[PDB]
Ligand binder design. Structure first.
Ligand code: FAD
Length: 285
């Protein structure tokens, strides 16, 4: 859809989530994570750089984390338009960067393309090694790029020293890292993404909890059905998902035939049956 419509839609979704009045530590926690992310964007980021004209590019790889961020970002883009009108919708696409690699799952590539069309992203896609170099090439093509939005957060307990607004290290080309999802935990991610009713990468439906490349990521061994029985913690969000109101259906994207072959050897609960952040990357490495 056109960008103004995507932005207004995401605004309604986020607003609707913020109006959930349920007994729930998860919901209340996620409402707080939403408010902080939106405060970073509206109060610290969009005040300093334009989210429309190319000063900022959004790094998007179709994963759950940058998808949640993209929905929040679009919600803030809607609000930004009115704030700037108040202090003084364009027909265009949102500048976005996707690094495509040889080991990228086709299912994910397809999801990136489809959601680029849904959210009206103007996609730069690299030609299918090291991410630092991929971005160095990007910045050389688009030197006006001042900042890049990154859906990074803490997914193991180890010290990382990340900040919401942070310069790249000297290894990397110079631009500002914008990392407003940093305080989200795994339960917040699933609660919001399932509530949104937006389509999500079909790999999560097959037991992935973290998506890498074909060779470095698998369904989460802790979701293997014959040896684990996790409870569903997001039933309310699923049943009452935005605009849904078949209540129990989850909007997963199609698995590419090649990936279906690759996964035939796999007996796994969907990713949203994992809430233990310590175990999020267990299917990786
Ligand atoms: C734009 C950018 C700038 C970075 N700058 C530094 C730096 O200065 N110093 C440093 O030590 N490390 C830097 N990194 C690496 C980063 O800190 C993480 O160590 C690395 O991304 C792996 O973390 P992760 O596995 O948790 O998340 P990842 O799986 O890498 O995902 C984290 C986020 O990065 C973006 N991303 C990941 N893969 C892609 C892709 N293929 N295409 C487009 N976006 C993608 C998405 O927004 C995603 O939400 C940078 C990474 C990116 C993407």
């Amino acid at each position: 859809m056109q960008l103004s419509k995507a932005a207004e839609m995401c605004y309604e979704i986020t607003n609707s989530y913020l109006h959930i009045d349920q007994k729930s530590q998860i919901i209340a926690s996620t409402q707080e994570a939403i408010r902080l992310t939106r405060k970073y964007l509206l109060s610290e980021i969009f005040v300093r750089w334009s989210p429309l004209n190319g000063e900022i590019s959004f790094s998007y790889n179709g994963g759950k984390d940058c998808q949640v961020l993209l929905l929040l970002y679009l919600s803030c883009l809607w609000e930004y338009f009115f704030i700037k009108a108040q202090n003084s919708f364009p027909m265009q696409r949102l500048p976005t960067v996707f690094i495509d690699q040889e080991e990228t799952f086709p299912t994910l590539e397809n999801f990136v393309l489809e959601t680029s069309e849904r959210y009206c992203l103007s996609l730069y896609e690299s030609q299918r090694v090291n991410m630092a170099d991929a971005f160095r090439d990007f910045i050389k093509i688009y030197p006006e790029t001042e900042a890049i939005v990154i859906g990074i957060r803490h997914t193991d307990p180890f010290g990382e020293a990340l900040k919401p607004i942070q310069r790249t290290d000297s290894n990397w080309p110079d631009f500002m890292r914008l990392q407003p999802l940093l305080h989200w935990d795994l339960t917040n991610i699933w609660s919001f993404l399932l509530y949104s009713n937006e389509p999500i990468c079909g790999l999560y439906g097959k037991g992935f909890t973290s998506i890498g490349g074909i060779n470095n990521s698998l369904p989460n061994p802790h979701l293997r059905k014959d040896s684990n029985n996790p409870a569903l913690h997001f039933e309310w969000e699923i049943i009452h998902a935005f605009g849904k109101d078949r209540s129990s259906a989850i909007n997963t994207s199609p698995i590419s035939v090649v990936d279906k072959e690759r996964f035939s050897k796999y007996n796994y609960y969907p990713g949203w049956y994992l809430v233990d952040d310590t175990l999020e990357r267990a299917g990786r490495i």
